[model samples]
Structures are given as C-alpha cells and as structure tokens.
Target: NLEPQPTGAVIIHTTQGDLKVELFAKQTPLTCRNFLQHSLDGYYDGTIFHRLVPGFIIQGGDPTGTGHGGESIYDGGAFSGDLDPWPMDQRKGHNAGPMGVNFKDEFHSRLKFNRRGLLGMANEGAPDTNGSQFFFTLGKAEELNNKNTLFGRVAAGDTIYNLMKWGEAELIEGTERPQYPVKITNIEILLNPFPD
Candidate 1:
C-alpha cells in the first residue's frame, strides 16, 4: 500500500481571485504529474473552467474557450493524448461522471470525497479514460467516493468554490459542454520542505 504524503500548494488564479490549492502527489502521482506539467508549462494559463454546476463542481483545464475544449482534442486540433487512460485497479473504484474523454478509477483509500475541497478527476463512463477534466467538491457526497478519481484537495481557495455556486449553468448550442465559463489565470506548485 502507498502511504499518504504531503504535497505542495496549487494556486488557481481566477477572475474573482487567487485560489491556492494543494496537489497530493503521493495519492495521485500520475494525475498530479500531468496537471503540474501542464500548469508549469503554461498550458492552462488562459484556459477557462468552461463547465460549472452549482453545488457540484467548477471544471476547467480546457485549451479552447468552449467546454468541449481539451488538450487531447481541443483548440481546433487533434488529440495529444496528454490525458490518456491508465490501467484500472481491480478494486472497482471509479466514477461514470460527465466528461469529453474518460479514465478508469484510480481510487485510494485515504483520498475519499467526504467533505468540501475534495478534488478529483472528471471522466465519462469509460474505464481509465481521464483526459484533462476535473472538478471540486462543494459538500460531502458518499456515492462519489469510489466512483471518481481521487486527486488532490484545496489547501487554500475555498472561496473560489463558493463563488461558483451562485449560478446555474446553461447548455451550449453546438458543444455538449456547459456554458459556465470559469477562467484559470495561472497555477503555481510550491515545493515541499526538505528532509533533514
């Protein structure tokens, strides 16, 4: 079994303000690796949340302005496979939530959705099919525990989550993605303390 380790801070610069979050590298190594690389490389600098559902999540990581945007196949380009699907654990832990691409469940025991600030990868019904779509937990929801990919939690920016809950998102005409636009100005990962 993998032990839970402390991670660095993730600052999500939104239109409202800067949301500082923490990425649990020990819990979701692959997911964090992808996210951090993208953030650091400025792939998500001008990206918008795109999808917003009140009382659920504020999703982003899209290269295009539309909700259908994704690194794999967004911005009027082909798939890059940055958010490809990994192997699934026989533990039967994953979610069939909404997403353009999908990934199998990579659930950890300690990374459960029990409270606010819970962060997880967003995916469709496909197994191990995650590709650049994620959301935040507003409240405790047990059913979402094993069904979704447990990533990291918000170490700081709970206010950003609160601001998104004020409205109901509408559906776009062409794209199946939501019309709620939540912009991510920038993201920074603060390193952890060194061992003595």
Candidate 2:
C-alpha cells in the first residue's frame, strides 16, 4: 500500500529539460532507497537515454551508454551473476544488472502503469533484475504490470517527458538510439520536502 505522504523527490536534469518525480518510499522501500542512493552518489550523471521509442518510453541510467553497465545499491556494486545465494523465501527470481548486486522485486497495488508519466525500473527479462536503469512511459503501458517495478511518477516538468517522447532516435539493429543523445546532466535527491 502507498503511504498517505510522499517520502521524497528526485529531480532529473536532462539535456532537454528537467523532470521532478515523487518517490514512493513506503510503497516501494527498497527500490526507492536504491534509486535515492544512486542519485546522491551521482550514478546517473552523464548517462544518456540510450533507448527512445516514439509513443512508447525513454530509458537511461547506463553509464556505458550501450544499454549496459550500472551498479545496484542492493548488492553494493555491479551485477556479476555470482553472489551469495538468497534464501528461498526471499528470492523472487535470479537476476542482476550493470550494478554488481541484484535486488529482489517490490511491487504494490498502488504502483500500476495505467497512465503516462509513470516511472519504472528497467530490468532484464525476468524478476529481480532491477538496477540503476529506468524508463518513463509516454503513454499507458498496462502490459508492464508485475513485470517492471513502478517506483515513482512525474510530479513536475511534464514538458520534459514530451520532449523525450518526441526526441529523435534512429532505428539501429532493431533498437531506437537517439541521433544526438539526450543525456541526464544530474539527479538531485530531496528527502521529506513536504512535512506534516
């Protein structure tokens, strides 16, 4: 369940514009913390939106810029596919990302891809693959339910989302790669900006 209040905000400054997202800490604690840590540590700095599908979504957070490479706060580094085994009950599925650590899946009823501007974690084709990579929906993506982890949503700067959606991307090897590249200049983490 989602908390009555937001836990924090993440301001993503991109080459085109800025996007402010509200983090659902209570609803997705681990995912929120992982993303917050990455933002504070400058993991997303200079990362480009390597994948941009028109009328679909824009993805980034890979330092390598090749749709690969990133570290996870969960395991403390890049995913190596070889780590201490998680308990059966705790294991959702085996997976890893550019980050050395692989985090477990965290999904909630309130986090659904029923509309645009929804922020979600990008993973390999399986559970527990969430790392630093993420995407913003250009429109409703109901097929993402129970597949990707929805952690945040656009709280401000909707224009940036549109710019990204309409951004230029060339069809290369069946993947959309921006012609000029739309990069994330920086990420700012705001904790408890709204207090009761």
Candidate 3:
C-alpha cells in the first residue's frame, strides 16, 4: 500500500515573483513524486504557461517549445502508454487520447475549491493522464469536481495568485493560441527527512 506522507512546500519562481505551494503528499503520492522529480530535474524550467482562460486556470509544461508539446520522457517518447492510468465511472467526464493506458484516481476528498489558491494537475481527459502540464486556480471552480486530479493545494502565496489573476498573454502569431507565458523558473522543495 502507498504510505501517506506529510505535506511539504515548493517555491515556484514566476515572472511576477515566487509562488509557494504546500503539496498534499499524503493524498497523492504518485502525483507528488512525479512533480517533485520533474521539478528537481529542471523539466519545468524554461517552460511556458501556454494556455490561459480568464475563468479557468492557466495551463503549461510543454517542453517541445510549442504549446502542443508534452513531456517526451514521460510515458515513453511523444507516443507511448498512459503516463498514469486509473479507472473512471461513466458519469465522470474523462480526458482521452490514442493510448489505452490510464492512471487510477488518487484523491477525491471534500476539499472545497472556494478560493483561488488551489493547485491541481492538467490531464488530457483521462485519469492519470497528468504528465507535466499543470495549472493554478484563478477562482473557485466547483464544476471540475470528480473530473480533474486534485493532487495538492496551495499552502502559501495568495499574492502570487492575485498577480496572475489579471496577467495577460500575447498569442503566438502563427499558432493562434493564447500564450500566457509564465515560466516555472525554479522550484525548491522544503521538507525534513525527504522521502525516498
């Protein structure tokens, strides 16, 4: 069985300032471990928040230098098995793709999304589809319940959230996609007796 672990904080450097995140390690070990490993390996560095919608969270983590880019090293190359796989009910909306792999749903607690400080993974329409792309909630979006991966919650830096709230992005001319460019910059983990 996966052991529940204590929470830890990570500092995310953005153009505005550092947005610290207190991860719910106990609730989502695989998700947290995947995030931590990529962070430590500098996978998020130089990446951009390629997608942004006013009422929704901003999305990023494409390493191909393109908005459509995903982590090539994840599942296996650009085309491979599901990065993470999990079962889902017909009632719940799921993200899909070419592959048959999926990750089991992790945490689905009653943690209400009543604020803008919530942080969660961005999947491709299936459970465990979370690779590198992630987003920070701009406001309470209860509509996403039972659909997205609620890996962790923001434990600090409400100011950072405010800064990104009104931030604008220039659409890359050719792509026609709204490029709300925000880089990961750096991520520093704070923990005691780090997990192995």
Candidate 4:
C-alpha cells in the first residue's frame, strides 16, 4: 500500500453547520500559518460570507462585513512598516500603502482547482495581495489554479454541496450578498499536523 499523506484538520463552525477542512500544512506552510493565526486571533468569528457565486465560490473572512475589510496576520498594524516590504516584481504600479501586507503566492502545480471543496486565499486579483479572505469552491475553477493559493479542502465530501446551498437567496441588488446571513462562528483547530 502507498504511504498516507498528513494534513491538519479544523472544524469550521458556521451559522449553518460545521465543515471539516484538511489543511496542506507541510506543503503550504505560510498560507496555513496566516489562516490559523487569524483563527486564534478570533478574527473570523461573527463575520458574514459577504460574497457568493452560486456555482463558483462563497467568500468571507472580512471582519467588517464589507468585502474590503480584514488584514493579513503578517500585516502588523502598528509595525506594518517593519515586517517586510512587498516584492518588487508584484508591486509594480501598485500603491505602497502603509497598512496592507501581502505575501508571495504559493502555487503547487500538481494541486489544482480540478475538484470542488478547495479552500483558496482570495487576493486583490493581482499577485501576492492575499490577506484573511478565503473561499470554498462550489465547483471546479481551473482559471484560479495558479493565481490563488489553494491551501485546504473540505474533506467531508457532501459538506461542500450543503455549504453551497447558503447562496440560494437572491443577492442584494448588484452584489453577491445573500438575502439572508450565513456567518462563521469560529474555526476550531483539532490538529496541527506539522511539527515545529
């Protein structure tokens, strides 16, 4: 038999229900670190899923309930300037905002948007603008393959389909906002599969 692959698991408790997520801890350390840290900071609790595309994705993690809110754990608020500067290549023609901290992309060619349930970091539609925003894929999205970092997956198969149902309501006016609210209660880490 082949050896088994190890991954950390977290139970994402939401207003609707819970979903088990398997994090690619060893392979995508940076992304995992940032997400988990935010969980510990209680950053995601009570935040509504601000955007939803019925067949594509369900995006949230913005504390302000506005799509533009939420900061990366790496974006040290008071020490924002001291952590690290944005990469030169990805920063071309971008504003050097004193508040935003974006990390580089972590793309594993073999791991792709070839299936549903993928948990990917949402960026500013540009390189390395990843923050606390993330989404659960409702269906395959090949276009997002190398653009966004896919760090985890909804391992409990049917949960994704159920999760997608939260988007059934008519969106608010021109936004992807659902008619009703579905929020993340908390993200409880059951196991940190990687050793320090």
TM-scores of the candidates in the order shown: 0.68, 0.79, 0.71, 0.83
Each prediction's RMSD over C-alphas, in Å, is 7.5, 5.4, 6.6, 4.2
CA displacement after TM-score superposition, residue 26 of candidate 2 (Å): 0.8
Go through the candidates in order and give each one's C-alpha lDDT. Answer: 0.60, 0.72, 0.59, 0.75
The lowest-lDDT stretch of 10 consecutive residues in candidate 1 is 72-81
> If the candidates were sorted by their lDDT against the true structure, best first, what order would they fall in?
4, 2, 1, 3
Worst 10 residues of 4 by lDDT: 86-95
List residue ranges in candidate 2 displaced over 4 A.
1-5, 76-100, 156-174, 192-196
Q: Candidate 3, residues 35-130: lDDT per residue as tens digits?
A: 777788898887767766655676667776455556422342222234332222211222333333323345556544455656777777765566
- Steric clashes per prediction: 13, 9, 12, 0
Writing each residue's lDDT as its tens digit, candidate 4 over 10-105 gives 888888878788888776776787788788778899988889898788889899988897777655332234433333333322323444476657
lDDT of 4: 0.75
The TM-score of candidate 1 is 0.68
As for lDDT, the candidate ahead, 1 or 2, is 2
Tell me the tens digit of each residue's lDDT in model 2 across 26-128. Answer: 7777677778777878888898888887767788888898877775665643322344223223433343333235676778877788877878889877878
Candidate 1 lDDT by residue in tens digits, 77-105: 22224443332221123322123333335
Clashes of 1: 13
| 1 versus 3: better TM-score goes to | 3
